[PDB]
């Protein structure tokens with residue numbers, strides 16, 4: 001009676017928690033520049049550095065948005081993007097602030113457990129690339145059409161699927177059980 | 187001793203047969 | 213659901229060759245580059261998650 | 263005495279050996295039952311969907327008339 | 341199936357003396373003992389489900405490595421064979 | 433439709449969730465986009481199982 005229902009409930013709970021943890025795994029990080037931590041690097045454990053390579057749109061935006069952050073981020077990688085990625089993989093660099101497309105491709109191509117922050121969807125100041133042409137040039141009207149005509153088809157989509165790819169989709173713990181046992185025994 | 191190993195073996199068997207059955211009966 | 217199939221952004225349309233095109237586009241781009249666009253977005257969309 | 267023992271081990275000389283084997287069989291059975299429930303508990307896409315590529319009467323793939331989606335659909339071949 | 345499950349178990353493993361071992365291998369003092377036995381049962385159930393989850397936890401030309409050349413993989417074929425001809429015509 | 437309000441001189445600036453496509457860019461002029469987005473599938477779905 002009571003014991004049969006008890007063992008059935010125990011079996012159901014075991015199966016339920018097994019399926020609960022089996023289809024449950026996700027990784028998340030800080031919210032990005034909106035956080036006060038990025039706004040205020042000076043903390044109890046200040047960030048090691050912010051990898052904003054100068055002479056770019058990111059540098060201009062960050063200088064014209066948060067002058068204090070731009071001044072603090074002077075410990076930036078000069079040579080190239082690859083050196084900064086290697087340094088971050090080793091561990092000297094704390095976080096990298098750079099162009100969304102290049103960083104996303106590097107994440108999707110590079111191996112290991114390195115992932116872009118959750119700000120992939122919440123990318124800051126999403127502007128997009130472009131094909132700059134001379135001021136007031138007559139070439140504006142055709143290209144504006146033609147490239148756009150590329151977009152309203154499978155051309156650019158398939159081409160992007162071809163060139164920029166690589167998998168390693170930018171999506172495990174045990175101490176929660178110890179936390180549970182500590183809480184129960186408390 | 188014997189009983190701890192017995193319950194560990196029972197747990198391992200339950201898990202093994204569960205993972206086995208997860209991909210059976212086609 | 214589904215992968216995005218037409219990745220073209222929105223736009224504020226106007227009559228052809230109107231004198232405002234440069235200024236309207238530049239102001240929209242500046243506000244988007246500034247925090248104004250993100251602020252207007254957060255308080256108006258993506259503010260609910262059930 | 264066996265009538266109560268069967269219920270007890272279900273809810274838990276050669277006679278004792280038979281009882282122990284029966285208890286082990288019952289334990290194996292309940293383990294199989296819980297694994298079965300776990301497996302049972304463990305046991306829609308974009309424009310690539312065959313229904314979305316080959317028209318089907320079971321699905322009403324409808325959009326906004328005269329909108330941009332109609333224009334995008336009007337140009338591709340299939 | 342050796343040393344594949346006991347990664348965190350030994351780390352967290354750290355008349356009553358016999359009762360603890362018995363219920364591990366299975367007034368307010370009896371209530372505490374019953375609650376401890378239930379906690380041990382929950383723990384061993386979690387252990388077996390964790391081992392089950394751990395046990396539960398390469399493509400064609402569409403592979404990005406097979407589309408974008410990579411030095412970690414040596415995608416080699418038979419020289420001068422038909423496969424070389426098929427590869428010679430497509431663009432990427 | 434509403435593009436008649438712009439081409440026929442009824443209006444002078446189309447402010448709406450306007451999507452950028454070919455013939456619209458052909459007849460009228462646009463600006464830089466202020467919101468990027470794609471086309472997506474909406475389907476009713478019931479998650480829980482008793």
Ligand SMILES: *[C@@H]1O[C@H](CO)[C@@H](O[C@@H]2O[C@H](CO)[C@@H](O)[C@H](O)[C@H]2NC(C)=O)[C@H](O)[C@H]1NC(C)=O
Pocket residue numbers: 053054055077078079
């Ligand atoms: C951004 O541009 C400036 C301007 O050239 C670069 O400064 C040069 O840096 C190199 C390497 O340290 C020096 O040899 C030059 O003398 C510098 N020129 C000047 C005018 O200061 C700077 O390195 C660039 N930042 C990068 C590439 O990240």
Ligand SMILES: *[C@@H]1O[C@H](CO)[C@@H](O[C@@H]2O[C@H](CO)[C@@H](O)[C@H](O)[C@H]2NC(C)=O)[C@H](O)[C@H]1NC(C)=O
Pocket residue numbers: 231232235
């Ligand atoms: C577009 O913006 C420019 C920049 O402000 C405007 O040019 C100004 O026009 C006023 C009034 O004619 C002058 O007082 C300023 O000296 C001009 N400044 C510059 C830098 O040109 C222009 O009038 C605007 N056009 C429209 C249609 O809005």
